[PDB]
Structures are given as structure tokens and as C-alpha cells.
Amino acid sequence: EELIKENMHMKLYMEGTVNNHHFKCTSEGEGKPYEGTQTMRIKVVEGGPLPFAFDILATSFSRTFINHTQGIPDFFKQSFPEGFTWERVTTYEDGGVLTATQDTSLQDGCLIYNVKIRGVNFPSNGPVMQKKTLGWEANTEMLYPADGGLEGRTDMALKLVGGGHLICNFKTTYRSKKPAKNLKMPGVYYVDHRLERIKEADKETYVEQHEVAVARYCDLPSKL
């Protein structure tokens, strides 16, 4: 946890399939873990240009960079040096389903991400396959302890050309490679996220993304 500095660098490898299209990506970036901000510069290195909106891959590119406010125990930062994993299913309301699994490790002071993606049943005439998307709205995730890890739930809204949205729901399981005796678990909490596309080029084979993420309790008054 004192392994995680005020500025940290990251590198990533990603591969998988969406429908029948194979691809690979790599990225590099940096952020301030305690401030909850980060930047990633991404290259589609195989299978580009993608025949699907890049927005569906956006959330798969970094949990160490969440500002855990209010003394909330930090499952992610606490996991180092052992590191951690995550597994997710994202279900779009028009049929697309994307699962993703991820390994996070720390090697010579650099965070190293290895991601796998498997997307299926995206409608060939819907807005993902037809590239009619304009990035994600901000969202709140709820995290709660479950099976010795953390589970997360959120709904995210994918902006469409013309002003509408396509909604998706995701369910994540976060697992620490640190033995449970050395981790103090949080209770229920919330993470507010704003994931933004900063730059793109060459039919989204180059993308720059930024994320700000701040964890908190619910601050509403309680009658109890």
C-alpha cells in the first residue's frame, strides 16, 4: 500500500473478440492514485479498424486509481505487492453481452494490466456495430463485500448520435491475491466515476481516455 506512490505509471495488454472480430490493444499511462485521476493512451495493435464502437471497450482499460475518501478501507491499494484481479459481465439492453477478466500486478514500481475480452450477440444493425455512440455518461457504482472479495454493480448510459442512450448493466467481482488476514475489508460504499474520451485518431485505433473516480459513503442524513 506504501508501494502505491502519489504518481504511478501503468502499462496494459488487451486481447479478445467481439462477435467474430479478433483484436489486440496495448496502452500506457499515468495517474495520481490518491487523487483518483488517470490518463491512458491506447493503440489498437491488431484487428484495427474495429467494426464496433470503441466505447464498449472503454471500461476494461484501473481500480488502483480511486480516491478512497472518508477512511474507507482501500481493497485495491491494500492488495499490493500481490496485486489483484477482476471479472465482469456487461449486458446491454439490446442484446450485446461482454465479459472481461483482468490481472493487475506491480512490477518494478509500474502497474501492469493484462485484460481479456469476449463480446457476443451485439446486434449487427444496432448502434454499437454501426458506430453511432458518443461516449459514456458519469455513473455511480455500489461496492459491497461478498465471498471474501468485493462485488460491484452499476448501470451505465451510452450516449447515441441524436441525443438518446443505450443502457447497460454490469456486475463485477474483485478478488485480491493478498491473503485475507492482511486485508481490512470495507463495508458497503459508492464510487462516482467520470470516464472521458480526450483524443482519438485513425478510426479509433488511437484513443486517449481519462477517468476520475472518488469513493464515498452516502452523505444523506439518516433517521436511524
Add this chain to the structure above:
Amino acid sequence: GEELIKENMHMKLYMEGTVNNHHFKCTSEGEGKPYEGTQTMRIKVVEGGPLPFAFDILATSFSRTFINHTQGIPDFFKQSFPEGFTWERVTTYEDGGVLTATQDTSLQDGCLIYNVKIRGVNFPSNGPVMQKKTLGWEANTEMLYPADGGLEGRTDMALKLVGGGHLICNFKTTYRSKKPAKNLKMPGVYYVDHRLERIKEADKETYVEQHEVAVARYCDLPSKL
């Protein structure tokens, strides 16, 4: 329209429905401060009590006029008067239970009148809802966005269980105004932070008092665009 909604408002409600195959009716009366986003409801199970399922699965079906819209967010619900509005929802529990609910909201002699219809099916007969192992809801954030001249809402809610766990459910809501579109200023995407709390119960949950605070906001995180 907004002028019809005063600083202090009373409510009256009728509910009937089924869960699994158990029929029930409820009645309630309450009061709140619509602009401050707080309300209290005192609820009676008048038929089919004691219910064989956790009253918690009905708790979110008992009041959208009572949201504090911060930051100038246009208020779809308050703007709807005097015509009023309706809502429809499906709540899906991760162990199989599915609860649909439809609701009519009207203003009648300065009283808010709720008529609610519930149909819940396929709760597991040996799960925590049917065996009454629940302890109320965690706080939650709902996302609301415009769709089809109305609003839709999405949230995930966590139902606390005896022993420390949670059972998660997801709900998808459509809110429809009875006011003609040309007379509504529509909001964009926004968020509502909610805390629904049970304050009293008696007689195997045939008498229940609930309180809700709801506060609407934009996302306050800084943006790079």
C-alpha cells in the same frame, strides 16, 4: 403546476396485488416537504396480513413529487401537476424473484393520491424474501434520463440480510407525465441519491412507518471536456 405543490404536502395511498400467489392490500397516509425531498408514510396491511414475505420488497412502491432537485434540474414530477403522472417498474432480484409495479399519482383537493398495483412472481420459496430474513435497504443512486417524451430510471439496490450479507436487485422504471409535452421542460441526464429507512413496525409488519430522503443532482466530478 409547480405552484400546486406546496412546501408541506399530505399523501394518501391504496395498494393491491399479489406476490407469488398471496393476495394482499395496503393503505397508507403520510406527509412530506417536497422541495426538501423528505417524506414519512405510515402503512397498514388491511388484507392478507400477516404477509408471508418480507415487507421490504414493497417498500419502494409506496412518491416522486418529494425529490429535492438541486442545481436547477427541471422537475418532471412537480411540473406534471395538476394532471399528474404515472410510473411503471420491474424489479429483478438476483435469486429469481421478479416484481412488477404500476402506479397512478394524482392531486385531489390539495392531497396527493397514490393508487399502486403489485405483481410479484417466482420468488424462491426457500429464499430470504419468502423466509423473512431481510433487514432493510442500503442507500442507492438512481440514474434518470429522457426517453419517449418521459423519463426512465435505472438503479441497483442492495437488500440487507440477517447475518450480514446482501441480495441485490435491479430496477428499470418508466415515468410518464399526463401533462402535454409542450407544457414540460424536460431535464437531461441526472442522478437521485436516495435513503429509504424503516422507522417503526408492529404486528408482523402489518403496520410499518417508512421515511425517505431523495436529492437530485448532476455529477459533481470535474470534467476534461
Add this chain to the structure above:
Amino acid sequence: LIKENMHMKLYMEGTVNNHHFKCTSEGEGKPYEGTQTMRIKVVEGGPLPFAFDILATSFSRTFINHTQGIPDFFKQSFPEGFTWERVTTYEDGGVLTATQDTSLQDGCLIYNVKIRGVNFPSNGPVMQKKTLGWEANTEMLYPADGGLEGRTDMALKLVGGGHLICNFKTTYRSKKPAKNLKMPGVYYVDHRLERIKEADKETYVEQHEVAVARYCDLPSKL
């Protein structure tokens, strides 16, 4: 108790999205041959602003031909009768729940059904009335919790070709105690539900169903 010929009467009420409605019907069929006809009237809320097809499956489990000696949970439930509850999820977001009570009063089968559908998209084929009835389907039934559960996918034909798929999950509960019921194991019902006649923007509808229960007759290595 359940004779070779049987008549039926039904009341239905409910809501889809925000549209309230009521229907009634009568028909007859042959419970042992798995066939039945129902003539159906929309008596309040007509004409419906949604495709009647979404209601078709809610209008009769006593009329399934249970072959090969499969213990027939439905027919054994008399005179006490039985209920069912269902959720149908459409792949474009419509969700319809339905609960039903089936009783036998003075030789006639009596049905009381309640419908609540939500979230049907206003541009989709259901709310546009651009559907052309159901394909045939096979339902899987299996014992669970002292009742039976059913699983099927159904394909709703669309004006202009293609289909909209839905999935349903059904729970069938007997009003007769467990100890006076022989339970089946896993089995399958083949169904063909067709519309014979409509009139007056679907406010009158005639429907026929044939339903036959069977085991799987593929050969087994075990």
C-alpha cells in the same frame, strides 16, 4: 372429473405500460387430445394500443395430451384446482407478468387471470401492432418445490419478416396436498397456438391451441 369434452369460462384484467383493460372468454376442447378453442372479447379498454399476441398465452393447462403415461399434474389437481404465475421477458425490454387461478365449478373450468406488463418500447412491434402471431414451441417442465416449473422461448412473427424473441418462466402450483399427487419427472410439451379469427381492431379474437406432452424419444447411450 375431467371429461372427454370440457367447456371453459375466463375473466382477465390488467395493465400494459399504462393501459388498463379487461377481457372475457369462453370455449371448449378435448382435454385428453390436447386441443381447445377460445373465443375472446375485449370488454374494457378496447381497442388495445398493443398487439393482442402478448396476451394470447395467458388465455389452459388441463388441455394438454399427456402421452406415454406421464403423470398429469394439472388433471390430478381436481377438484381443488391449481394456479400458475409467469414472467415473460421480451428481448427489446417488455416484461409481462401474469398470475392465474383455475377452478372446476359445476362441471365447467373457470379461469381468473391478472396481467401486468411494463416497459414495452413505444417504437417496437408490440406497441406498433406489427406482429403476426407465434411460432410453435417446445416447453420444458420439471419438478421444483412441490410444484412444476416451465421454461420456454417463443418467437413472435413480425410484419415485414423476422421475429422478436421472448423467454418465459412459469410456476405451476397444485391446490391438492403433495401426498395425493403423483409428480412427473422432467418432460416436454409441444405447443402450437394459432389465431383462427379476429375482428374490430382485435376486440374479438378466436384462438386455438394443440398441446402434446412427451418424453424425449432420441436414443440414449445410458
Add this chain to the structure above:
Amino acid sequence: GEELIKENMHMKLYMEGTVNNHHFKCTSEGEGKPYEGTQTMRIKVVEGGPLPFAFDILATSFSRTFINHTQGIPDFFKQSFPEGFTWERVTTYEDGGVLTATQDTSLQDGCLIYNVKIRGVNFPSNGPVMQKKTLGWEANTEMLYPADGGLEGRTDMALKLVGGGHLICNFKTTYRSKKPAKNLKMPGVYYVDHRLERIKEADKETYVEQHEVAVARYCDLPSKL
């Protein structure tokens, strides 16, 4: 197209992926009678064995060329050769497990070659899959229908459980031919009856032999139209 698929065919397969963060690899070989709908596959877990999860969840990912198409139903799979075809699938278990799979089917020197990738998530640790308390699959009927120059399939499958009862799952499949649509005669709606059986196993499911029979038909029920 169909001329390349003989009365007897051989298959080889490679599989890899992950279920709840356990990585694994499998190989298989086998043979069958494509036009009679029968086939046998002998499978080795070559990396990650013994698996911490019921092998039953992988069984449906190990061969669409082996469907007996009765009644003149145009056979999308056999017509796709020599180019071959792919499939993609999501299987949703009623206790939360989700398994996505994608497959490449090709024909090389008269051998069918299968390349399969598997990604399973959220299988509950005290459920039957992760506790390895399953006893194979019931028979099932799949519905197939054309959609967008492809074929989609829908089915519910019942997984037999140690102690009696079943865990139910649903799957949604998309089959895509590599052959241009120009050269394919598409079927309409039809049905496939399946019976997938475990014939033998050894060494804690690191060796498994499976058989499948699959027969396509229309519905034989009389029609009133």
C-alpha cells in the same frame, strides 16, 4: 459445400479460457456421422486440471456439422464448407453464472478443426458448478431462426444436481457462415432435439468422453391454418 462433408468425419479441437479466474486448456479428438446427427468426442484437460468447476459447463462448447437435418431443412452448417463458420454464445445460469463462448469451425485435409474460447464469470462459490455437484444435462430442444443473414438459436437446458433437482440455464447463440449469403439457401424457423451424454470420465474430469445426438425437424403438430 455439402459434398465435402462425408458420411463419416473426424474432428480435432483446441479450447482455452477462464472460469472465475481459473485459466485452462483442453484438446479433443473424435468422430461422427454428420447426416445421422451422431458424434463422439474424447477430451483432455491439458492445462489447469483438475478444474475447480463442473466440466458440465464446458460440454456444450465441444459441433454443428453433426445435425441430422430431416424434412428437407436446408443445412446452414454443411452448406458453409469449404469456407466454414463460427458461433458465439452466452449461457446464463439461474444462480448468476455467465459463460460466453466463441468458436471457429474450419475444414482442413478432410478433418473438421474447432477452435473455441471460453470466458465464464460470477459462478457462485457455494453453487453446484463450483462445488462440482452436477450430474449431466437433460435432453433439450433448440429453436433456430434466421436473423441478419445468420442463424440464431435459443434454448433452456436443465443441469442435474447431486441430491436431486436441477439448475436451469438459458442460452442465446448466433451462427455466422463464412460463405457469402449469395451462395446459401437459408432455412426458415426450425427445431433441433439434442441429447448430450457423458459416456466416460477419469482423473477428476481431466479425461472425458461425450456423445451427442442431434436431429432437426419442423413442428409435426397439426395446424388449423
